[PDB]
């Protein structure tokens, strides 16, 4: 279990609104990396997922032997452990168990979550290029693997209701899932088939971030028209790209008990990868900006239970215009107008302040993470701290031109020294070993 | 415990003399690295030690937060696990436990060894520059830490007899130790004080490798004179630089039961770092070439027991003129004449063939490892396979100029597929994260 | 069920057009044969049928106690199991159930197919020499046996419509059938009676392979005339030798629900033995060359359903001039001109590349299998890989003169190691035990 | 379970003394072989073990990929099933489960035995040439694997008392073991160390078959002297070559509960491979003639229990001078005089008549099996029926010169047709597939 210094400083809003204004990033600290490196120049390690809870943490990433493209073979590395203080005062992520799922099943886009006594991981089995998944009416095989600290492993092929003949494809968001009221929730996304109930119930719905008006040159009527069209992709089999949550009861004999809960397209942007968080008793969702709006998307999620089962989810966006992501064409970091984009990168963010602490939800919110500081290239990885409109602290890593990709950020507090540490898991392009080197950067978020 | 595919292919001579002539190195294979990376540009990870036995493996290395120099603080990372096959057929070193000794004790030059149920590590506590250790008549504190797989940890300060007032300094060789007949043996080296019994019993002794004559331009009398002087260092407090073995009985209450067994200087070169191996029931020793002879030094060690206690060791050298190491001045890779050098690098080698299988010990021996292919710079890391006089297979890693340091090589056979794999743990200079990135390269040694 | 290493590498085109050009056959690998041997010098085991699907495989062959000729007694051996990896990396066909249909019913020319939970086998009951079957206006009794993995066995005598008074004889093609959209499809062939609707609707129809013109010395008008006559056999009761497909709904009370679907003689050659395959969602058919064209015949089959029932089939030939088969007289492997032949051997082929991946269907197709390399004798069994015009890789088995007969080839990929294996089931003439020894040769199809 | 036609005709003496005089071998019958064949010319399948009991049968053999020599890798094929009648009246060994132990553990000289609900197999792990096993004072690892029909598999490393420091080596006899009064008994053999209690208690003991006197030209005193020396092998590490029985209680957590019971050297010849049988409630033992006496050795074994545990075994030889085996030098099939031989072949025999039915034990005994009819070569496999002094029925298989090796014979009666069938499992040298083809020949033993 995690050291006494951290058990009470996990999954919480660490600073008050007033303190958020005076936060800065401290130097990067050196700790032994718990994320394994490739041992060949061409080896590819990508798509990390990290879950940290009161008792322990779970980590995983995909491994492809040659290059970063394969719709046939790949392995998935899983790791779990605890956090303990070093003589210098900062954290050391102590790995207590390692697993390497290597058996011919092409498990991809995996999301992992901490569960009592272990980790629960959700993946889909890839057997063809992603685009092909959207055209085929049949969805890929879905799997949830439970790995207990006592080395017992139980993998199940799941068939949640409302998936077959509704979703042409379904993928975990790769971002961490969360254990909530006895259920494990994972972010999901995919393409819905035209004519289905879901498609019809979503017809004419759209979402436009609160701060777009002041930045978009198009009029309200034009924005609305373009936003509605941003949820449909002709390139991806003419499917409605949908975001949602997969709720699975913690059982070892899962079959069709997991529930697919899609977000209303009136509250969320075009479906994309994502991540779920827990701040106190509140669930939050991060949605990758793979559509027209290039800014960080965070939402407070309200989950409704009907007869002990999740029945519906509602999302309230934290309005911001900060931390853009690189995109292609008319969907770069400089875009502000609705339309149809299918480009971007995964770059989640951690809320250091409570959005509900202000009279108007999210009026003054502070968050931290990493982002690729450029308009269209996946370059210049930069760790930051920002509020709704400005970056109040940042530090680029490496020299300009340094390639990078996804960035998963997680923060926790040392209740002993009373300092907050954040880990920024970034996929860095390396010139020595492997295509990428996933690095768990760690530093303090200083108040002052 | 290790998979059934490896339990019977560990610590053995894998090939016959005839087969050794047709061995070649296969491509590097990609597996998840079990050696942790630094998370800052200046973080320093160095001095690895690796022990692999029938049941499991032990790994460790030193971590310094800023740069690679400190005689005050540093931490020591320890790891242990097993080997299991991947769907591609090659090994995956599965970490089952991690430890980070971080408490203010500056444990350095640590050597680790597998023991039933865990790992035994031997370190010395550094409190001043190395050179200062040789001048002070008092030796550094010595410690042996036993770490059981059941998480029990027992550290002891040891005071073996014949150390105080004999050795001005004493260090573990950093190379792996071995569990032999109930005792854990570790390679050691240091400086002996003038006038001591050890010094006197070693007076006028010297060792000259069998293949030096044909390569040295000096006459026999001159070589003998210079060789005798190569065991004394005026730069290192005028001490006799000695190599040896530390034998510790496997106990949890060690105090003065470990025994310091020095090698006769008539059979070994000037003391240096080293490593111990087990090939069947035979113990072997690798001695870093930190003196005048720049070639790989391997010896078969014969241990004598008197009343259940190791009482003396004898070493028989495997005569070679292959695989040189970079050195400074008149002690570079091109040197062949006796004299006093105090320069070189650690680069052990694994014997793929049995030296005793030939009528004349070591007449035709084959070994593998890595070496820095250059005369004086620690550059061009190159993995190879060689016999007594030639390199019969090699492959440089990275582009010329690539900096590197130590190299620990270990081989084992998959008794299922019947192929031999070797792991080459090399300290590589990295430009992205940390001063060095210790990489566990792995590839096959192909027969044909 | 099959190991995770194979469940996703079955019934697919494994290579791209570009990769097909660089394919070669690896050494034969040794695995325990799952095909039973005879225990007497005269015992005869022949006519194998093999079906491999995602979950498991089904195998069967005919057993005659004395010699290879009997129109009265014979037994049929059935076997089923899964595929799992060996420590050497290659497959082991693990038999999980064996059955020996020995009860006096002379079941012949059986074709077998995998079905959910078991195997479905289709045979006809022989009671007289084959030639006699064509002269008698009454067709032989037809039977389909379902054998579930739970040991339940259900055999039914079927009477599909349009058989009585239309087909003088009807036989399964012996090649595997396939489970498609809830129906089990089997290849069939036989002789149709003059004056029947089928006969009339087939009148004046003929098929000439695309690559015959350039190789045949006869003019177009003469070729057309001879091709039309190749579908009628005076030796076989003056019947129209027809090829087709038998579609049976997966039920345990089959009576007259199976449907006989003949191929149009404008798209297929004279009826003969055959086999059905599944490549993704596409059905393919292999037609033994028992007529004038001695080259491998493969067709993509398009099945039309009318009210949930197969109503018609269409075949598109993959144009080739490669891999001939031994024949008698003016119908040997060297023949190229239309006429009436009734000679040849069964030698199916597996498509390693997708014929539809080229702008012009089958313009560049690659396939593998075995063939008897000789003009008129059933001799020199040779495994190969070939494209439309040339054999790009081959290896004869045994010494010249080695007798053999049928060859059933099936390939699948290990999604773990990412290699393709093909099994070549060949009837080999043996000098020790039995007339023939049906051997499941297995080797890899290497890319490079 | 076995068909009703065989459940009551297993493990019994089938004929009376009077009927034994009129027994003859019927033609070989053709049934589908349940023993798997190799699929490469060099593949090697050898060392079969077969156990047949009231409910079912167990079968196993060793598989080496290249040639028949390896002290590192090999796999072990296991099979189990039942017996059922065919329409022709004779047996069909129906395989209901197959297993292929392929994981890097070099399991050799395995003996298998039927147990309620499955099979228990006993093997030793080879890691060096056989001769080396006798010189090393440490015995090879011993393992017993239980394989239940419900697919549960439990393998255990056993350490029976009195093995370490007593037996330099220990091997299962490869012949079948038997389930007796809740214990599984396996034949064993190996080399005992000089000076051990076993060695001392065996000192000066020897056994000379009752019918040697009349055939040996040496006098009684000389025979006795030479016989005593035949139990010690200087070629095999100067060990006393011992035969015995390993008794294991049927448990799934075996550790040190199995008991090593050596035969008194006053009742048995030099240790060798062997087999255990059950005839009614009596245990019998077959001992390979690897010493000076080249004739078939069968003994009735009396087992003594002390506190529910086997405590001692006694053997009574069935005196014969029939069915010799090929041997080397002065130990060929023509030898009759005591001395030290270490040559021969495994060729067990089944007793068709009860040796205890005669006033003088074994005065008139009849048995059947196969033997290599030649003086020194492993050639001319011949199935027979013989009494103490003559072969009363025989039939060679193949043409003279045909190579073969071991032969395991098992007989049982069809209580329906009232006929006895015997299966002769013979390792035949094949020219087509594999080094050997282990064939389960089957025929009737006719009374008349
Ligand atoms: C299931 C899957 O493939 N997931 C990948 C995701 C998804 O593509 C994303 O969530 C949208 O569905 O994203 C990642 O893959 C992208 C990456 O390989 C980049 C590299 O340039 O290319 C993207 O594809 C572009 C393509 O390059 C364009 O030419 C055009 O075809 O549009 C596509 C849009 O997808 C990949 O999607 C990612 O790195 O962000 C990784 C996940 O494996
Ligand atoms: C206890 C200890 O310091 N161990 C280090 C060893 C020992 O120095 C070696 O076994 C000989 O006693 O070696 C390592 O350290 C050397 C490394 O830092 C190099 C880098 O250039 O410098 C060596 O020192 C040189 C120095 O650079 C010269 O100017 C001159 O003073 O000679 C000294 C000789 O020691 C370090 O010894 C090593 O990397 O090989 C690392 C161990 O920590
Ligand atoms: C139902 C049946 O008999 N099937 C057999 C098939 C069919 O004959 C084939 O699909 C054409 O209808 O083919 C196999 O049998 C042939 C084989 O026994 C060879 C051996 O030489 O002889 C063929 O018959 C020849 C005969 O030898 C000629 O003299 C002349 O009469 O023509 C006939 C043509 O049939 C057998 O057909 C086969 O091995 O290919 C086996 C099937 O059992
Ligand atoms: C554990 C083991 O090796 N078992 C093998 C047994 C034993 O050798 C036998 O029980 C005596 O200990 O026997 C088998 O192996 C023999 C076979 O390979 C023959 C082939 O010629 O050679 C025998 O070795 C001879 C050798 O050829 C001679 O030159 C001289 O060295 O004597 C040895 C005597 O052992 C093998 O033992 C067998 O086939 O009978 C097979 C078992 O694997
Ligand atoms: C943060 O710093 C500002 C600037 O000096 C100070 O005025 C403010 O009180 C601090 N914020 C709080 C309340 O911690
Ligand atoms: C290795 O290769 C050589 C060169 O062809 C060959 O002659 C030799 O027999 C091989 N070595 C052995 C004995 O494995
Ligand atoms: C196959 O080999 C050829 C010959 O070197 C090479 O040029 C080609 O690129 C390879 N085919 C592919 C694309 O895999
Ligand atoms: C066996 O055959 C002999 C020879 O005819 C006959 O005399 C004898 O009675 C038979 N044996 C018995 C008793 O079955
Ligand atoms: Ca789909
Ligand atoms: Ca000192
Ligand atoms: Ca008919
Ligand atoms: Ca031994």
UniProtKB/Swiss-Prot annotation, chains A, B, C, D:
This is Hemagglutinin-neuraminidase. Attaches the virus to sialic acid-containing cell receptors and thereby initiating infection. Binding of HN protein to the receptor induces a conformational change that allows the F protein to trigger virion/cell membranes fusion. Neuraminidase activity ensures the efficient spread of the virus by dissociating the mature virions from the neuraminic acid containing glycoproteins. It is an enzyme of class 3 (hydrolase). It catalyses: Hydrolysis of alpha-(2->3)-, alpha-(2->6)-, alpha-(2->8)- glycosidic linkages of terminal sialic acid residues in oligosaccharides, glycoproteins, glycolipids, colominic acid and synthetic substrates. One of its GO terms (biological process) is symbiont entry into host cell. Its main location: virion. The C-terminus (head domain) is involved in binding the cellular receptor. GO terms for cellular component: host cell plasma membrane; membrane; viral envelope; virion membrane. Disulfide bonds join 44-68, 58-119, 110-123, 216-337, 248-258, 331-341, 411-422. It comes from the Viruses. GO terms for molecular function: exo-alpha-sialidase activity; host cell surface receptor binding; identical protein binding. It is a single-pass type II membrane protein. The chain holds residues 118 to 565 of 565 of the full protein. Residues 106-111 are annotated as: Involved in neuraminidase activity. Residues 1-448 are virion surface. Keywords: Disulfide bond, Glycoprotein, Hemagglutinin, Host cell membrane, Host membrane, Host-virus interaction, Hydrolase, Membrane, Signal-anchor, Transmembrane, Transmembrane helix, Viral attachment to host cell, Viral envelope protein, Virion, Virus entry into host cell. Glycans are attached at residues 22, 150, 387. Belongs to the paramyxoviruses hemagglutinin-neuraminidase family. Homotetramer; composed of disulfide-linked homodimers. Interacts with F protein trimer. Its EC number is 3.2.1.18. It is found in: Virion membrane; Host cell membrane.
């Amino acid at each position: 279990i995690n050291d006494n210094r951290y058990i009470n400083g996990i999954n919480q809003f660490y600073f008050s609104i007033a303190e958020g204004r005076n936060l800065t990033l401290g130097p990067l600290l050196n700790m032994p990396s718990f994320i394994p490196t490739a041992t060949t120049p061409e080896g590819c390690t990508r798509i990390p997922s990290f879950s940290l809870t009161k008792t322990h943490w779970c980590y995983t990433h995909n491994v492809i032997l040659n290059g970063c493209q394969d719709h046939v073979s790949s392995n998935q590395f899983v790791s779990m452990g605890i956090i303990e203080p070093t003589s210098a005062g900062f954290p050391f992520f102590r790995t207590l168990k390692t697993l390497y799922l290597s058996d011919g099943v092409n498990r991809k886009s995996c999301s992992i979550s901490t569960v009592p006594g272990g980790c629960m991981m959700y993946c889909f089995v890839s057997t063809q290029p992603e685009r092909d998944d959207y055209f085929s009416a049949a969805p890929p095989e879905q799997r949830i693997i439970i790995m207990y600290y006592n080395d017992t492993i139980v993998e199940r092929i799941i068939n949640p209701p409302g998936v077959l003949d509704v979703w042409a494809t379904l993928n975990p968001g790769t971002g961490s899932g969360v254990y909530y009221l006895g259920w494990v929730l994972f972010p999901i996304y995919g393409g819905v088939i035209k004519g289905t109930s879901l498609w019809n119930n979503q017809a004419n719905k759209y979402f436009i971030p609160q701060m777009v008006a002041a930045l978009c040159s198009q009029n309200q009527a034009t924005q609305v028209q373009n936003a509605k069209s941003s949820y449909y992709s002709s390139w991806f089999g003419n499917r409605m790209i949908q975001s949602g949550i997969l709720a699975c009861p913690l059982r070892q004999d899962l079959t069709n008990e997991c529930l697919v809960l899609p977000f209303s397209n009136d509250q969320v942007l075009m479906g994309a990868e994502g991540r779920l968080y827990m701040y106190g008793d509140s669930v939050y969702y991060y949605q990758r900006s793979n559509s027209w709006w290039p800014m960080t998307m965070l939402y407070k999620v309200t989950i409704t239970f009907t007869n002990g089962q999740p029945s519906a989810i509602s999302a309230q966006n934290v309005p911001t215009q900060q931390v853009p992501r690189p995109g292609t064409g008319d969907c770069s970091a400089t875009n502000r107008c609705p339309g149809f984009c299918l480009t971007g990168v995964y770059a989640d963010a951690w809320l250091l302040t409570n959005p509900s602490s202000t009279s108007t939800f999210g009026s003054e919110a502070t968050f931290t993470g990493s982002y690729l500081n450029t308009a269209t290239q996946r370059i210049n990885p930069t760790m930051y701290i920002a509020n709704n409109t400005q970056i109040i602290s940042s530090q680029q890593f490496g020299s300009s031109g340094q390639e990078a990709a996804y960035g998963h950020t997680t923060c926790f507090r040392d209740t002993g020294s009373v300092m907050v540490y954040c880990i920024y898991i970034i996929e860095l392009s390396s010139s020595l070993l492997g295509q990428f080197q996933i690095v768990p950067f760690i530093r303090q978020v200083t108040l002052s």
